[PDB]
Amino acid sequence: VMILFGPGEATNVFQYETVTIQITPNIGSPLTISQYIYQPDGKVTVIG
Amino acid sequence: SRGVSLSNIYQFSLLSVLPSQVNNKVQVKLGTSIINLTLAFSSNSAGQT
Ligand SMILES: *[C@@H]1O[C@H](CO)[C@@H](O[C@@H]2O[C@H](CO[C@H]3O[C@H](CO)[C@@H](O)[C@H](O)[C@@H]3O)[C@@H](O)[C@H](O)[C@H]2NC(C)=O)[C@H](O)[C@H]1NC(C)=O
Ligand SMILES: *[C@@H]1O[C@H](CO)[C@@H](O[C@@H]2O[C@H](CO[C@H]3O[C@H](CO)[C@@H](O)[C@H](O)[C@@H]3O)[C@@H](O)[C@H](O)[C@H]2NC(C)=O)[C@H](O)[C@H]1NC(C)=O
């Protein structure tokens, strides 16, 4: 699953913040993903 | 030991207070001169103050 940010959500980096993603298929329980994000530490960072 | 017991002493927080509410709002008269104090320091990272 990959999320690409547009110019709205891209505007400044997530820091000291909780990000929640939820995937809700048409049958069965949704998957809810939550991370508190510290300052990102590389070009890619492991947040959760 | 001395029988002092206070169940709640917590009254105030500066976490509620923006820098603009305290900076330049207390001042010292050194003779003729009057100096505005800066009390809340601040810095920026990732667009947060
Ligand atoms: C330093 O502290 C002073 C006292 O808190 C403060 O004076 C107050 O100013 C506000 C509005 O600010 C304007 O007018 C002041 C002069 O009074 C100017 O210094 C400032 O540049 C603005 O033009 C006013 O409502 C209030 O009555 C003032 N209080 C007193 C006791 O005089 C100063 O503004 C503040 N900063 C500087 C740079 O001196
Ligand atoms: C702590 O808060 C007090 C209010 O609870 C305040 O007392 C008031 O003081 C004002 C005048 O304040 C100016 O002048 C003093 C010296 O006279 C400066 O130290 C100060 O920075 C200000 O520029 C007065 O009009 C009023 O009657 C006082 N109120 C009471 C209840 O006494 C103190 O000034 C304040 N402490 C500091 C260090 O600012």
Three-class secondary structure assignment of chain A: CCCCCCCCCCCCCCCCEEEEEEECCCCCCCEEEEEEECCCCCCCCCCC
Q: Compute the distance between CA of residue B46 and CA of residue A16 in angstroms, rounded to an integer.
A: 10
Q: Compute the distance between CA of residue A39 and CA of residue A13 in angstroms, rounded to an integer.
A: 8
Q: Compute the distance between CA of residue A13 and CA of residue A48 in angstroms, rounded to an integer.
A: 16
Q: Which two tokens stand for residue B47?
A: 């667009």
* B46 CB within 8 Å of a chain A CB: yes
Q: Compute the distance between CA of residue B38 and CA of residue B20 in angstroms, rounded to an integer.
A: 10
> Is the distance from CB of A28 to CB of A15 less than 8 angstroms?
no
Distance in Å, alpha carbon of B47 to nearest chain A alpha carbon: 7
Element (H, E) at B34: strand B33-36
Q: Is B39 in the pocket of ligand 2 (CB under 6 A)?
A: no
Distance (angstroms) between ligand 2 centre and the Cα of B16 equals 21
Q: Compute the distance between CA of residue A1 and CA of residue A3 in angstroms, rounded to an integer.
A: 7
> Is the distance from CB of A35 to CB of A15 less than 8 angstroms?
no
Strands B33-36 and A31-37: unpaired
Q: Which two tokens stand for residue B1?
A: 């030991």
Strands B33-36 and B27-30: antiparallel
Which amino acid residue places its CA nearest to atom 1 of ligand 2?
A: B26
Could you please report the per-residue DSSP string of B1-49?
Answer: ------S------GGG--GGGTTTSSEEEETTEEEE---S----BTTB-
Method: cryo-EM
Checking B39-43 for CB contacts under 8 A at 24+ apart, the result is: B40/B14
Distance (angstroms) between ligand 2 centre and the Cα of A36 equals 43
Q: Which residues of B touch A12 (CB under 8 A)?
A: 46-47
